[PDB]
């Protein structure tokens, strides 16, 4: 953690965008990061975080990203454009922290593409997402193009083509409309 890639079956299993997702008990989070140091060309980082429950380093993937980012990456004077591609939308605790962080470090911008909405009808969860939309962060649902990109960048794909599951696009529309509605 951060790993450079997922296995194929972990990707197809954990990023499938069904409404009833049994039992994806982990969250996975791919990221790209455009590091804009100030008198230098742009550089890029790329990775994958899984949530942790070992000994005493419990973190949802979001916290691990943030702990890794602060401890090892955040630097004087440089700007950052982060993108996440996340299996599940964030719990409201995680969304809480992230929104703090953004408001506090305004040199960082954050886009979050999410494959699935955890409990989209519940307001504690809708709250998290509204909070993040407020502190700057874009929140989108992953569509076909985003799945293809993560396949091509975060998986040991053996150079094979992405193989979309049936229903991928339908699931995207259903979840998009739910997002639009939640973010009034
Ligand atoms: Zn969380």
UniProtKB/Swiss-Prot annotation:
(Microbial infection) Following infection by HIV-1, ubiquitinated by a cullin-5-RING E3 ubiquitin-protein ligase complex (ECS complex) hijacked by the HIV-1 Vif protein, leading to its degradation. GO terms for molecular function: cytidine deaminase activity; identical protein binding; RNA binding; zinc ion binding. Changing residue 75 to D: Resistant to HIV-1 Vif and reduces Vif binding but is still efficiently incorporated into the virion. One of its GO terms (biological process) is cytidine to uridine editing. Residues 1-132 form the CMP/dCMP-type deaminase domain. There is a cross-link at residues 45, 145, 163, 166, 169 ((Microbial infection) Glycyl lysine isopeptide (Lys-Gly) (interchain with G-Cter in ubiquitin)). GO terms for cellular component: apolipoprotein B mRNA editing enzyme complex; cytoplasm; nucleus; P-body; ribonucleoprotein complex. Widely expressed. Highly expressed in ovary. It comes from the Eukaryota. Its main location: cytoplasm. The keyword Repressor does not apply. Zn(2+) 2 binds at residues 60, 91, 94. It is found in: Cytoplasm; Cytoplasm, P-body. It is one of seven related genes or pseudogenes found in a cluster, thought to result from gene duplication, on chromosome 22. DNA deaminase (cytidine deaminase) which acts as an inhibitor of retrovirus replication and retrotransposon mobility via deaminase-dependent and -independent mechanisms. Exhibits antiviral activity against viruse such as HIV-1 or HIV-2. After the penetration of retroviral nucleocapsids into target cells of infection and the initiation of reverse transcription, it can induce the conversion of cytosine to uracil in the minus-sense single-strand viral DNA, leading to G-to-A hypermutations in the subsequent plus-strand viral DNA. Homodimer. Interacts with APOBEC3G in an RNA-dependent manner. Interacts with AGO1, AGO2 and AGO3. Belongs to the cytidine and deoxycytidylate deaminase family. The CMP/dCMP deaminase domain 1 mediates RNA binding, RNA-dependent oligomerization and virion incorporation whereas the CMP/dCMP deaminase domain 2 confers deoxycytidine deaminase activity and substrate sequence specificity. This is DNA dC->dU-editing enzyme APOBEC-3F. The lineage of its organism: Eukaryota, Metazoa, Chordata, Craniata, Vertebrata. The chain holds residues 190 to 373 of 373 of the full protein.
């Amino acid at each position: 953690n951060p790993m450079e890639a997922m296995y194929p079956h972990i990707f197809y299993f954990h990023f499938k965008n069904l409404r009833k997702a049994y039992g994806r008990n982990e969250s996975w989070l791919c990221f790209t990061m455009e590091v804009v140091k100030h008198h230098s060309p742009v550089s890029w980082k790329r990775g994958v975080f899984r949530n942790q429950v070992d000994p005493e380093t419990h973190c949802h993937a979001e916290r691990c990203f943030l702990s890794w980012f602060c401890d090892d990456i955040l630097s004087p004077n440089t700007n950052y454009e982060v993108t996440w591609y996340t299996s599940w939308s964030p719990c409201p605790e995680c969304a809480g922290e992230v929104a703090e962080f953004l408001a506090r470090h305004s040199n960082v911008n954050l886009t979050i593409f999410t494959a699935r909405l955890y409990y989209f009808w519940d307001t504690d969860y809708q709250e998290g997402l509204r909070s993040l939309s407020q502190e700057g962060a874009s929140v989108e649902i992953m569509g076909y193009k985003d799945f293809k990109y993560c396949w091509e960048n975060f998986v040991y794909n053996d150079d094979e083509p992405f193989k979309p599951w049936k229903g991928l696009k339908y699931n995207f529309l259903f979840l998009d409309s739910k997002l639009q509605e939640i973010l009034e």
